[PDB]
């Protein structure tokens, strides 16, 4: 049975960062030489595996997430590492078995007026635990002051859009970017 | 009224270490993000540490290592570490906060002097007699976002601090002599009236662009 990964990489809407999209596969086949030759992404450079040895590999379940970041982000978005949207939006846990996809969907992705479907959030007390989203729209107060729940000076509101048009430097247009996840349990495997 | 205090200065001839303590109110270094910027004298200012609440932390690119920001939630004061110098590193020290959407740097102690995408800005230094419009045009490379932009007030003796932080919108005590509006790469700051404290110095301002943060040279206006 053919997998609909093909159907979630070739998919109109992306969730933004601060939600992300979470598809499963069960009891079913995937062929990965589409993703492995060419594509209409560009990018393909993971760490989970050797690429190569995917095929002779036994596998229990696959996890996919997609989302829509900068480009720079898209540097930063390998796990290991430390930054703003990373430590505070989406964290991938090291040794994680699966790997990364990467590209620029421009043409789509810009618009006139400005693509502000796609969000960011930017304040937190704290870090963030691997694989945890907190899709919060409470206002948030740092200082001194809690503000009473209302809008103010020193408390602010987390959640803020990006700043999108057709025309644009490289690598601050918004990039679709789609990762996978790779794991064993004790049930059959079902791939 | 939130207020900021720090003491540091002397070692005329090298000394290896150094210590200024950033006491804030109003916020905790927990809060928020905190920044640290340098100014050389008579020379541009730069972008050299930053550290995001929650622990994370970065540092100037032009000189990697040899300091180390460590944030102190138990006495509110931050401080800076230094393991040794050279020349070329002194310059007044400014600790500051910044949010980097509705405020770029926007609250400023009064700091002290240590001792041992680009902006240019087209019109350069201008002299002129009160009472004439004058305007000012800052040009990039990468044609980034109008969001980005902001512009800073310098006068000699005082803290800098900023206008406005968005490039559209005037943050507070809005004065009706600036404004802000740009087309593409440049970004237009035109002025309607000259005051006393106005006949000053400028910086054309990029935030969000990057973790790091540049500034401009700076032009003189009066
Ligand atoms: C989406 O694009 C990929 C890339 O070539 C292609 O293999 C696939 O057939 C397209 N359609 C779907 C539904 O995946």
Not at chain 2, 48 to 61: E, L, N
Request: glycine share 8%; with cysteine; aromatic share 14%.
């Amino acid at each position: 049975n053919l997998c609909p990964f093909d159907e979630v990489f070739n998919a109109t809407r992306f969730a933004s960062v601060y939600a992300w999209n979470r598809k499963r596969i069960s009891n079913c086949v995937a062929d990965y030489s589409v993703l492995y030759n060419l594509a209409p992404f560009f990018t393909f450079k993971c760490y989970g595996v050797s690429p190569t040895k995917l095929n002779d590999l036994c596998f229990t379940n696959v996890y996919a997430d997609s989302f829509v970041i900068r480009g720079d982000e898209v540097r930063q978005i390998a796990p290991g590492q430390t930054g703003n949207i990373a430590d505070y939006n989406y964290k991938l846990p090291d040794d994680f078995t699966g790997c990364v996809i990467a590209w620029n969907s421009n043409k789509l992705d810009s618009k006139v007026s400005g693509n502000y479907n796609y969000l960011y959030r930017l304040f937190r007390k704290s870090n963030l635990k691997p694989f945890e989203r907190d899709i919060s729209t409470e206002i948030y107060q740092a200082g001194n002051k809690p503000c009473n729940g209302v809008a103010g000076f020193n408390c602010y509101f987390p959640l803020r859009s990006y700043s999108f048009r057709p025309t644009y430097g490289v690598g601050h247009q918004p990039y679709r970017v789609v990762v996978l996840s790779f794991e064993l349990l004790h049930a059959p495997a079902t791939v | 009224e939130v207020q900021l205090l720090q003491s540091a200065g002397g070692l005329v001839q090298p000394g290896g270490s150094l210590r200024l303590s950033c006491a804030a109110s109003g916020f905790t270094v927990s809060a928020n993000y905190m920044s640290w910027v340098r100014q050389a004298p008579g020379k541009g200012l730069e972008w050299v540490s930053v550290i995001y609440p929650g622990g994370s932390t970065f540092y100037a690119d032009s000189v990697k290592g040899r300091f180390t920001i460590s944030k102190d939630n138990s006495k509110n004061t931050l401080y800076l570490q230094m393991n040794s110098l050279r020349v070329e590193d002194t310059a007044v020290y400014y600790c500051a906060r910044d949010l980097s959407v509705a405020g770029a740097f926007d609250i400023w102690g009064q700091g002290t002097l240590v001792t041992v995408i680009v902006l240019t800005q087209s019109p350069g230094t201008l002299s002129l007699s009160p009472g004439e419009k004058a305007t000012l045009f800052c040009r990039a490379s990468q044609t980034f976002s109008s969001n980005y932009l902001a512009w800073y007030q310098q006068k000699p003796g005082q803290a800098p601090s900023l206008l406005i932080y968005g490039g559209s919108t005037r943050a507070a005590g809005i004065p009706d002599r600036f404004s802000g509006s740009g087309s593409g790469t440049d970004f237009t700051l035109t002025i309607n009236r000259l005051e006393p404290e106005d006949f000053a110095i400028y910086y054309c301002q990029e935030y969000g662009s990057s973790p790091r943060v540049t500034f401009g040279q700076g032009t003189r206006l009066e």
